[PDB]
Design a protein around this motif. Structure first.
Motif, short mmCIF file in Angstrom:
data_model
loop_
_atom_site.label_atom_id
_atom_site.label_comp_id
_atom_site.label_asym_id
_atom_site.label_seq_id
_atom_site.Cartn_x
_atom_site.Cartn_y
_atom_site.Cartn_z
N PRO A 69 0.81 -1.22 0.00
CA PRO A 69 0.00 0.00 0.00
C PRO A 69 0.84 1.27 0.00
N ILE A 70 0.47 2.18 -0.87
CA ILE A 70 1.09 3.52 -0.93
C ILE A 70 0.03 4.47 -0.37
N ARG A 71 0.37 5.13 0.73
CA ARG A 71 -0.49 6.12 1.39
C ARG A 71 0.07 7.48 1.02
N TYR A 72 -0.72 8.11 0.22
CA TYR A 72 -0.40 9.42 -0.36
C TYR A 72 -1.45 10.43 0.12
N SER A 84 -6.88 8.12 -8.63
CA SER A 84 -6.10 8.50 -7.43
C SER A 84 -6.91 9.41 -6.50
N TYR A 87 -8.72 7.71 -3.27
CA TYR A 87 -8.02 6.82 -2.31
C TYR A 87 -7.14 7.64 -1.42
N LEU A 88 -7.48 8.92 -1.20
CA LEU A 88 -6.65 9.72 -0.27
C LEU A 88 -6.54 9.19 1.11
N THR A 89 -7.55 8.55 1.67
CA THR A 89 -7.48 8.05 3.07
C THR A 89 -7.28 6.54 3.15
N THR A 90 -7.40 5.83 2.03
CA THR A 90 -7.29 4.35 2.00
C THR A 90 -6.03 3.92 1.31
N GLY A 91 -5.48 4.76 0.40
CA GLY A 91 -4.30 4.40 -0.39
C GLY A 91 -4.60 3.44 -1.52
N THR A 93 -2.43 0.10 -3.64
CA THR A 93 -1.22 -0.71 -3.75
C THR A 93 -0.44 -0.29 -4.98
N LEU A 112 3.52 8.90 -8.62
CA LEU A 112 3.88 8.05 -7.44
C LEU A 112 4.77 6.90 -7.85
#
Ligand SMILES: *[B@@]1([O])O[C]([C]C([O])=O)[C][C][C]1[N]C(=O)[C]C1=[C][C]=[C]S1
Length: 265
Positions: A69-72, A84, A87-91, A93, A112
């Motif tokens: 997971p990439i949390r951005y 994109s 998925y600000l709070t969930t990230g 993969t 990313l």
């Protein structure tokens, strides 16, 4: 003597008001069709296919990279990030970012993934490592899209694109599980229905990656095509034009792809 194969491509580009570059390979016979095949054209979003392949290569030796997971945050978003932005709070993969970049051309996902490789230089170095000496990328989204005539930065050639695409989708540049994932991402692309896909018979299978710089009539598509009853075809179609406000054309890309498929032995 005059190149009779080339004449309908020259007419097509003249009608379009710019330049068209085409390379197509019949992997069964070794036949090719070539038109301005070694000239440089801006990559635009078509770089994102090769980006995903470079990430897949890294994933072979980095256990669980694709599953990571990439949390951005919102600082990662840029225009044309429709996946994109959700998925600000969930990230997402690495695999999900790769699918977004390939299948939706998502800009934030592309940036990313470039970070994961060490930036545009890292992707260029991956392309050198598979034997592509032509590909050049030195900017992130959105700066790589300026497409100014005579700027060789952020360009490749139709021939080099096709050669690299064949290595990565059909050859040995990726291990088979990674090759297969790249193929599946290209097959699921959503952005290419009016480009190479519009040129093939409906019963042929296609995996493709588009790009649209928009300025200077600049847009493109490359594809692996699995024709009925034939070995795969690999092809690339790129366009550009001399004025900033010249409009790209999907129909011209499709038309060039049709001529390539017709001429190809
Ligand atoms: B990319 O160069 O091209 C994408 C569209 C495609 O795959 O053909 C969209 C993102 C990138 N381009 C831009 O950000 C500018 C745009 C051009 C048309 C829609 S957005």
């Amino acid at each position: 003597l005059t190149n009779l194969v080339a004449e309908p491509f020259a007419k097509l580009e003249q009608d379009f008001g710019g330049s068209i570059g085409v390379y197509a390979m019949d992997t069964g016979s070794g036949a090719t069709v070539s038109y301005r095949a070694e000239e440089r054209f801006p990559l635009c979003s078509s770089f994102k296919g090769f980006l995903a392949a470079a990430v897949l290569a890294r994933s072979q030796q980095q256990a669980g990279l694709l599953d990571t997971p990439i949390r951005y945050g919102k600082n990662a978003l840029v225009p044309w990030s429709p996946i994109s932005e959700k998925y600000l709070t969930t990230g997402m993969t690495v695999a999900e970012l790769s699918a977004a970049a390939v299948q939706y051309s998502d800009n934030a996902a592309a940036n990313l993934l470039l970070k994961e490789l060490g930036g545009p230089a890292g992707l260029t170095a991956f392309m050198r490592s598979i034997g592509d000496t032509t590909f050049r990328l030195d900017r992130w989204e959105l700066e790589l899209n300026s497409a100014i005539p005579g700027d060789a930065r952020n360009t490749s050639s139709p021939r080099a694109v096709t050669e690299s695409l064949q290595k990565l989708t059909l050859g040995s540049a990726l291990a088979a599980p990674q090759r297969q994932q790249f193929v599946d991402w290209l097959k699921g692309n959503t952005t290419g229905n009016h480009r190479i896909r519009a040129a093939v018979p409906a019963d042929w299978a296609v995996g493709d990656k588009t790009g649209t710089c928009g300025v200077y009539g600049t847009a493109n598509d490359y594809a692996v095509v699995w024709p009925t009853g034939r070995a795969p075809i690999v092809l690339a179609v790129y366009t550009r034009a001399p004025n900033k406000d010249d409009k790209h054309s999907e129909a011209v890309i499709a038309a060039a792809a049709r001529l390539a498929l017709e001429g190809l032995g």
